[PDB]
């Protein structure tokens, strides 16, 4: 029935393939949680579905339509359940439209944050990893089912808005502004950035990555601390370093939305949600790395968060070396940090664990061990192939190990496996060197 996630066993619907969310969100008073929504989901299926079952937590649906037609629906617990006139079968699509309104609820965990629709200091914004997007959007709230997004945000004329995707039009009537954003590459629900309140959009010159053009804009909310910046030149340099390692940047634009709040940063798509207290070079790199690892390559199961966070963390070492710093010393710093902490196999079994130090640093050292085993050329080739292999296909730890085995051989697979499996922390991975 549900996606069957090992950590959050009730989220999502088995076999559902949401392909596009067309969301019109209306936020009457930014900074206060009440809101209203008009969303049309374009949905397909991997198995015959007699119902469409979406996650929703807080708001109440008041109307539903299927292909422009009246349809049976019920809202029960944390789900909206839509009974179809006939089964939705693979290869077909339909349009499910839902009208809803009310107060998004924050999930209260274990987790670093209470994810969902945040409200503070005149700002409302999504910070919804892992499973908070369902607070303000009826959705298949699981990273195994990424989708494209077109968002129209209606706000009072004194406010502005920013969502993931390129900004096109802003219209205004009766004291209300409506802004349209189009996210054209599919990302998990939690990677939908959406911020309303006092903010300004600021463009920077395009970045050229060979034949690929990446547009540049950052969001600056009002009231940022003195010195809250995106240093000139930095984002282009990080885009070059990381894309040279991972393959083409997956999106049409990149930037950060700087918020005067105190909170973790989140890799929302092409527009990282960046509270000022997290605004550091290494964090900016890390969140950009997640545009590949997490947003493009998405998780089959939340137990495997290390494939996002370990890879994003390892990107910080790749960045550090590109800036002339000693990568092995950084790996040693990761190890020293872990050597006084409990360790675990990389596949998490508890919600407490999915963003813990093992997911970030034990996962990063796993990739360090692999890299030192196969050499830098093979390792960079492997990362390119990894991103291509799990584009349009959610990744798992088993699938990674299979790819390493076939691409890099059984010895490379065993090197990664000792880091993946095993309750005790392995020794620090160190260069072979001459005999
Ligand atoms: N994904 C963030 C951490 C985070 C986790 C959950 C959140 O809701 C927000 C942020 C990172 O890259 O470290
Ligand atoms: Na999908
Ligand atoms: Zn991360």
The answer to whether 136 and 117 are in contact (CB under 8 A) is yes
Q: Which residue is catalytic, options 254, 360, 386, 413?
A: 360
Q: Are residues 207 and 194 in the same domain?
A: no
Could you confirm whether 21 is annotated as catalytic?
Answer: no
Q: Are residues 250 and 388 in the same domain?
A: yes
The burial class, CB within 10 Å (0-12 / 13-18 / 19+), for 184 is middle
Last residue of a domain, one of 171, 199, 227: 199
Q: Are residues 227 and 323 in the same domain?
A: yes
Structure tokens given for 131: 């499973």
Q: Are residues 56 and 145 in the same domain?
A: yes
Last residue of a domain, one of 144, 177, 199: 199
Residue nearest to atom 11 of ligand 1 (CA): 266
The answer to whether 293 and 343 are in contact (CB under 8 A) is no
Could you confirm whether 200 is annotated as catalytic?
Answer: no
Instruction: Indicate if ligand 1 lies below 6 Å from the C-beta of 191.
Output: no
- For 264-318, what is the HEC assignment? CCECCCCCEEEEHHHCCHHHHHHHHHHCCECCCECECCHHHCHHHHHHHHHHHHH
**What is the number of alpha carbons within 13 Å of residue 218 lying toward its C-beta?**
21
Domain range for residue 173?
1-199
Last residue of a domain, one of 138, 165, 199: 199
User: How many Å lie between the centroid of ligand 1 and the Cα of residue 301?
Assistant: 16
Its sign, for the CA torsion 107, 134, 286, 312, is: positive
Q: Are residues 177 and 242 in the same domain?
A: no
- For 380-429, what is the HEC assignment? HHHHHHHHHHCCCCCECHHHHHHHHHHHHCHHHHHHHHHHHCCCCCCCCC
Question: Alpha-carbon distance 323 to 299, whole Å?
Answer: 30
Query: Would you give the end-to-end CA distance of the chain in angstroms?
Result: 56
What single string gives the DSSP state of each residue in 43-76? EEESS-EEEEEEE--S-EEEEEEETTEE-EEEEE
Tell the residue number behind the tokens 């996962």, with chain if given.
363
Q: Which residue is catalytic, options 287, 316, 353, 413?
A: 287
Maximal C-alpha separation, the chain: 77
Beta-sheet strands, E only, within 188-271:
194-197, 199-209, 212-221, 253-254, 256-259
Q: Are residues 166 and 207 in the same domain?
A: no
Its sign, for the CA torsion 227, 232, 236, 238, is: negative
**What is the number of alpha carbons within 13 Å of residue 142 lying toward its C-beta?**
30
In the PDB record, what is the listed experimental method?
A: X-ray
Structure tokens given for 278: 């997290």
Instruction: Indicate if ligand 1 lies below 6 Å from the C-beta of 267.
Output: yes
């Amino acid at each position: 029935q549900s996606v069957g996630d090992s950590i959050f066993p009730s989220l999502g619907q088995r076999g559902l393939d949401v392909q596009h969310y067309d969301l019109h969100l209306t936020v009457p008073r930014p900074g206060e949680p009440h809101l209203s929504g008009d969303v049309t989901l374009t949905v397909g299926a991997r198995e015959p579905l007699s119902r469409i079952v979406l996650d929703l937590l807080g708001p109440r649906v008041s109307a539903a339509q299927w292909n422009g037609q009246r349809v049976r629906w019920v809202q029960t617990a944390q789900k909206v359940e839509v009974t179809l006139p006939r089964p939705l079968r693979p290869g077909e699509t339909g349009r499910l439209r839902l009208i809803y309104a009310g107060t998004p609820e924050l999930s209260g965990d274990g987790l670093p944050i209470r994810p969902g629709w945040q409200n503070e200091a005149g700002l409302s914004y999504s910070l919804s990893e892992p499973h908070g997007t369902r607070g303000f959007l009826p959705c298949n709230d699981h990273p195994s089912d990424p989708a494209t997004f077109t968002v129209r945000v209606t706000v009072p004329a004194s406010a502005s808005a920013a969502a993931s995707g390129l900004f096109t039009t802003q219209t205004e009537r009766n004291g209300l502004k409506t802004l349209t954003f189009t996210q054209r590459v599919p990302v998990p629900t939690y990677a939908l950035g959406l911020i309303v309140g006092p903010l300004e959009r600021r463009t920077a010159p395009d970045v050229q990555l060979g034949t690929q053009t990446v547009h540049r804009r950052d969001i600056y909310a009002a009231g940022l601390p003195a010195g809250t910046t995106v240093p000139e030149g930095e984002t282009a340099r990080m885009l070059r370093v990381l894309s040279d390692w991972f393959g083409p940047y997956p999106d049409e634009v990149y930037g950060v939305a700087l918020l005067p709040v105190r909170q973790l940063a989140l890799e929302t798509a092409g527009l990282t949600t960046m509270p000022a207290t997290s605004n550091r070079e290494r964090v900016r790199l890390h969140e950009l790395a997640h545009q590949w690892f997490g947003d493009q390559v998405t998780l089959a199961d939340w137990a495997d968060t290390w494939l996002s966070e370990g890879f994003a963390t390892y990107a910080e070492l790749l960045w550090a070396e590109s800036q002339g710093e000693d990568g092995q010393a950084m790996a040693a710093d990761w190890y020293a940090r872990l050597s006084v902490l409990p360790s675990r196999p990389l596949r998490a079994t508890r919600e407490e664990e999915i963003f813990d130090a093992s997911a970030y640093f034990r996962g990063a050292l796993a990739l360090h061990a692999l890299r030192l085993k196969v050499g830098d050329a093979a390792f960079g080739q492997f990362l390119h192939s990894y991103v291509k292999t799990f584009t349009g296909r959610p990744v798992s730890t088993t699938a990674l190990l299979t790819l390493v085995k076939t691409q890099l051989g059984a010895e490379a697979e065993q090197t990664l496996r000792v880091w993946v499996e095993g309750r005790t922390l392995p020794p620090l991975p160190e260069p072979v060197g001459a005999p």
